[PDB]
Amino acid sequence: MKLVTVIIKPFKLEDVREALSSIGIQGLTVTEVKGFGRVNFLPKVKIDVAIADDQLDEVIDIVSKAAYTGKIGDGKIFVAELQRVIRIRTGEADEAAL
Template sequence: MKMVTAVIKPFKLDDVREALSEIGVTGLTVTEVKGFGRQKGHTELYRGAEYVVDFVPKVRLDLAVKDADLDQVIDVICRVAGTGKIGDGKIFVTALEQVVRIRTGETNESAI
């Protein structure tokens, strides 16, 4: 099992969620986050004054997937969330040692 953490542009969230649903992903956690990478923020104009926005708003998706589904999940996120422009985001994959469904006590892949 793997934990997939994807940081994407906020306006891509609904498209990514729908595409993941189509391939059988049944759950994910969404968090509004801020950060920066190579784009290093940007400047904006507010009431005639220019100011620097150091952190860009993003959306973080966390989803637990079976090893067999990992490549397909990554492919879908890349294809749907990508715009070809800087700031599209990143995907992080980490090993997931154990999962427990609290309501039923199911563990590991059956709990996903």
Template sequence: MKKIEAFIRPEQLEDMKEILDTLQLSGLSIMQVMGCGNQKGWKEFVRGAEIDYQFLPKIKMEMIVLDEQADSVVDSIVSKAYTGEFGDGKIFISDIGDAVRIRTGERGRKAVR
């Protein structure tokens, strides 16, 4: 199993939800986060003082998928989130040792399906 964490632009969220239906994924967690990277943020003047906004709003998506689904999920996220500009985001993929569905006690692949 793989954990996929994707940091994307907020305006891309609706496109990302389509991935769930298209790839028949069973779950997705979404969080609103703030972050910075190559995009750097912006500067504004408020009451004559310069304010440097280094953190920009992003959406963090987390999902656990089976090993054989990971490549297609990552490819789908990249194709939907790509604009070619700084701030398109990043995807992190890590291995998951086990999973447990609390309601039934199922473990491993059965818990993710």
């Protein structure tokens, strides 16, 4: 499993969400964050998604395309290993908790 973090332009959130939803991924966590530029703050949105290793390329692909504008500040995708997930309500683990 992988924990995919996406930092994007706040206005691209719906496009990213619908795009992920189009590939069966609806459960995401959104966080309001800030970046910097010339030194002012620049509002951004952080999306965290927990996935199976097999979904990595598809996610990177759909997310890139959906978050894209072509103007600087489009954002980045970060990938890290997710060792375990537990669905609190049922106690289901990993893929059953995704």
